Amino acid sequence: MKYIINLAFCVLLLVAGDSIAYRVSQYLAPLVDTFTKH
């Protein structure tokens, strides 16, 4: 039962690896450039 979610999660990781990396890159971009001087 729990196996299916694990398989789906990793399939999403491989298939969308570039897009999740892109999605969070500008999501936390406002977070990180405000961290530079702190």
Binding site: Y3, N6, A16, D18, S25
Partner: protein, 510 residues
Amino acid sequence: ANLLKSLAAVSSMTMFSRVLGFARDAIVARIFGAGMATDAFFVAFKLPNLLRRIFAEGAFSQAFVPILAEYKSKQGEDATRVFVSYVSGLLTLALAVVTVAGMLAAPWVIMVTAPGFADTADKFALTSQLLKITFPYILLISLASLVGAILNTWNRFSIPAFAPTLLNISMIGFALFAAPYFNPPVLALAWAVTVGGVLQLVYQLPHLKKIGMLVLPRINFHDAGAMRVVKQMGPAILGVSVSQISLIINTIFASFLASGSVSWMYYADRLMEFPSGVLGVALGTILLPSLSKSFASGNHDEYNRLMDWGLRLCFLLALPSAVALGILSGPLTVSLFQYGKFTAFDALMTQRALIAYSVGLIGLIVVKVLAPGFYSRQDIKTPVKIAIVTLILTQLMNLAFIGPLKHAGLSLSIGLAACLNASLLYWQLRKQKIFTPQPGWMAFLLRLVVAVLVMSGVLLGMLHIMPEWSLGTMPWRLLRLMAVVLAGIAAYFAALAVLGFKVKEFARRT
């Protein structure tokens, strides 16, 4: 001696696969240009290749081969046949479900994967068509690698190693000949990989007939062997996703870096995955079936001997490779990438990422030796535990190194991540009283390193004799490239020969 022969056969066949691979995109870019159609096929083809990491290469193999070895050694060939038929049927069902899912959700997958394809209507329509055609390739390569895995368990490694380059010949024929038969001709390449997948599979059935392991894919969910395979596939998928997460955050740091840095990491990774793929990956496919047979049979002293032999041969073939790549970080980049779009600046950055990656080149390969140790023990949880521990510590060195080292820091941190991953692998093996190395390791290291100074002294001496690499055209620059390295490795092996090292010392049976 057959262990060395099998390792040489797989490494040479992989060598043939990679050089055929470089010829593959060279002719493809020549005949199809570099338009939106060419990279559309690349996206549609790389997607099944990542799914290969689950069902064929990086998750199914270590969850199936150890069970195959136990079944073969203890139960017999009849129980092995019913086991392999059941797991193959379950694997076929799993691949059929995802393949059908891609059939009726190809546009959905395209926007999920590449948001830069949905906006372009003409490319979105094209890539959806190609993705539909090449989607069954993951199905074909899943059984193709499944047959390759069982053949490896039966000490047949030459046949599975031919399969990768076999697809290259099939794709080369379709692109060279059946270009005008499709409008647009790009669909010919989409059919090429699919036909290559079938040609890969049909290749190994005659060999599988010799061992009598041919079986119809019967279905039985309640069968214990299939349940065990899925149960161990749990941690295996977790390890694949953990490695995927580490790759994801590496991309996150790279995106935050300076503009144009991603290309330097990509090319350095190409020059780093080339030796680790030829050497480390090949070492995995031979050791994993052999270690599993020894562990299942109860020959623990043969399990330790195989582990030691894989370790010492890894050091023998990786330490000169890592130092050679570091020494020729300059010449390699200027002879493979400094062409038109590149300047002296871009080549210099790639050389800095090359030496940083080459520091962990030894780590990447030795990980491919140590990881099958626990994979052999039917204890996949421990490698994942090392994987998560490595993952968290990788990020804290990532954000520490991006400051003063930038892209060189990311490459070096990945290198140290693999090296310390291997030391964690070694520590767990010794702590649990599993692997006992044979005496004489200290002499092996000291004789190895002095041969490395022989490699460096010859290579830098030959470099300063060798005039500027920018002079000349494609054939001249490449010709001088292997010319120096063949003399360097010949000097390396000559140093090994005069140091009392012989091939017979690395000869293993069974």
